[PDB]
Structure formats: C-alpha cells, structure tokens
Amino acid sequence: STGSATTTPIDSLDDAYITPVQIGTPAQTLNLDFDTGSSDLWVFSSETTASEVDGQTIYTPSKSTTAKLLSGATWSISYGDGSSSSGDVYTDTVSVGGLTVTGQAVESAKKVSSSFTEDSTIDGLLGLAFSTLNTVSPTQQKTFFDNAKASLDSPVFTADLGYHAPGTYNFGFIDTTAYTGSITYTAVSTKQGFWEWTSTGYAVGSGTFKSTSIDGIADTGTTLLYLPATVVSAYWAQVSGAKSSSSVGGYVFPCSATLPSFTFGVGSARIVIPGDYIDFGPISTGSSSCFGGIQSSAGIGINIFGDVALKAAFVVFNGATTPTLGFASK
Ligand SMILES: c1cc(CNc2ccc3c(c2)OCCO3)ccn1
Ligand SMILES: Cc1cc(C(=O)Nc2ccncc2)c(C)o1
Ligand SMILES: CNCc1ccc(Oc2cccnc2)o1
C-alpha cells in the first residue's frame, strides 16, 4: 500500500504545516501537524477542556463506530518550546492520503497549553519519530508509520515541504519526479528516539564550504534551523545590522536586508537554503526588525534541522531494519 497527502503552511511565514487526516467511522477529518521529532498522535477532542478549544476541529470518539477506549491508558507530552498537552487514549481507524491503519492509538486531549489553544489551524499532532518516544502509559503505543510499515510497498515516508506553498507527505514510495539529481543517504542513530544524523558541514552565501560534523535531528515539527552558536554567528555576521537580542530571544536583522543563503552538507552532497527562507518577518506587527530563521541551539541540547532546512530538500525517512535519512535537492 501507499498514501499521499498534501501538507499546507498554516500562515504566511510557514510557521508550521497541516495535513488532513481521517479518523474514525464515519471519517472525522482533522488537520494535524506531522512531527518527525515526536511520537504521539494526539487530537483536540470532545474531551478537551472547553475553555481551551478556540476554533479547532475536534475528534468525537462517541460518534465513531470503530472507536474503542484504551482502558487505563493516559498520555502527557511537553515539547521543546514549552507547549504541552495530555489526556486519555482511544484506538480507531486512521487514514492519511488513502493509507489506512486500523487500531491506531488516537490520544484524546483533556488539557492543552495556551499556545495550542491559540493555534486555531492545528487540530493536533501526528508523531513520526521512533515509537520509543511515545508517551502513552502504562502500555506504550506505536506511531502511525510504525503501524503502517509492514503493509507499505517500501518501509519509508517522505517529506516535501513547500516554501510559501503546499507540499506533500508520501508513505510507502519515493516519487522520483519530486526531486532533482540523486538522493544522498546518511546514517541515523535511533538511540534518542529521533531521526538523528550528522551533517558534514556548511557554507554561508557564496562562501567556501566548512567541513565539520554537526549532529542533529530532522524535525518537521520545529519551525526553524537550530545550529551551534559558532555556525549561527558566522551566518549572521554576513548580514549588516544583525544582532542577537536577549529581549526578543534570538537573532534579529533589519527587515530591509536581503539574506544570504545557507548550505548544509549531506555526505558529499549539498542542500542550499535560499536566503528568503530564513526571513521570519517583523518581530511585532509593524516593526522594522525581523526575526531570523537560523538560531542557536545552545541551551537546547541538540541541533535541529527544522522546517527552514527540510523545506529546501526532498527528505526520505527510511524505516528499513537499519533506518537512514535521504536528502535530495528539488
Ligand atoms: C518560529 C516562528 C514562530 C512564530 N513566528 C514568529 C515570527 C517572528 C517572531 C517570532 C515568531 O518570535 C520572535 C519574534 O519574531 C514560532 C516558532 N518558531
Ligand atoms: C509557538 C508554538 C510552537 C508550538 C508547538 O507545537 N511546538 C512544537 C515544537 C516542536 N515539536 C512539536 C511542537 C506551539 C503550540 O506554539
Ligand atoms: C501559538 N500561537 C502563535 C503562533 C502562530 C504561529 C506560530 O508558530 C508555530 C505554531 C505551531 C508550531 N510551530 C510554530 O505560533
């Protein structure tokens, strides 16, 4: 089997991407944030505290003839940015782009933090990291990909995120029309539960490539590119007026600037992020200071190849017996 679904930016800055997902019988379609950095499929629901729902579409398990309470199971998750959610668990039929899993754990939110309530466009998350990170207790649950894998034509999914435009998540096949050149595959460590790999270096604009190993994770659920402070300083030093602002929480730059590109290495291959992908617009409405899309990972504890990086590439998440990651230009 295969599946193919379009993923769409939630706003004009590509702050996150939503993909329609069918849950239950008859189908209830919710727009979920596919997150290769976490491993829980959770949704706003008829159980979510009413004051914490503000425009989201909710899953109502009592209206699904295939929903079953997973008795005694609870979940609770906190993401790197301070947001969080928690609740109980159902199993139900879940379909993405024509690919169906029966008995998928659908984690129903009883509580969500304020930034989830504030994102009316995001009805929940669909985790695509390794199932060892799933938070369901006392019986840990598998991701949608993990459950689908044996039925797929090939044990893979691909992320093809757009810049200011829709893109695609495919399951079970590699669309050879969606990228240019060849796909370069690179080793993955699953020891922390992430799609963790080592980039071979970077360049800023037209500058010479610096060969240096940068461990990090491929994370579709993180907006920005978070890299070591040395790398980030070298980037922003090429932008007149750019500075790290403690009050804003990162590097800012004059909105009048045209930004240089940023290249990262994948083996001997190179992925080029155009400068415009690094512009996250005014720090507050009407400001002429703009927020940078490359930020320091110092204090995160891990480097994160988030949407800013991934949307410059066609990315293969290869879930073969030994997982690997593939990157192609597009
Ligand atoms: C990246 C972007 C966002 C939301 N967008 C956004 C845009 C500009 C900003 C911002 C946030 O926060 C800092 C000030 O400037 C949230 C998380 N990562
Ligand atoms: C500003 C913001 C970020 C998030 C958010 O969900 N973070 C996030 C970060 C990493 N992985 C998954 C999710 C929210 C609700 O608001
Ligand atoms: C959470 N409300 C503020 C807001 C609007 C857009 C964004 O940015 C997001 C949202 C979700 C995930 N990652 C980044 O934050």
Overview of the molecule:
The protein has 330 residues and is mainly beta. It folds into two domains: 5-174, Acid Proteases (Cathepsin D, subunit A, domain 1); 175-330, Beta Barrel (Cathepsin D, subunit A, domain 1). Helices cover 7% and strands 43% of the residues. The chain is built from four helices and 24 strands. The structure holds N-(pyridin-4-ylmethyl)-2,3-dihydro-1,4-benzodioxin-6-amine (F91), 2,5-dimethyl-N-(pyridin-4-yl)furan-3-carboxamide and N-methyl-1-[5-(pyridin-3-yloxy)furan-2-yl]methanamine (F63). N-methyl-1-[5-(pyridin-3-yloxy)furan-2-yl]methanamine is lined by residues 11, 15-16, 115, 118-119, 223. It is classed as hydrolase.
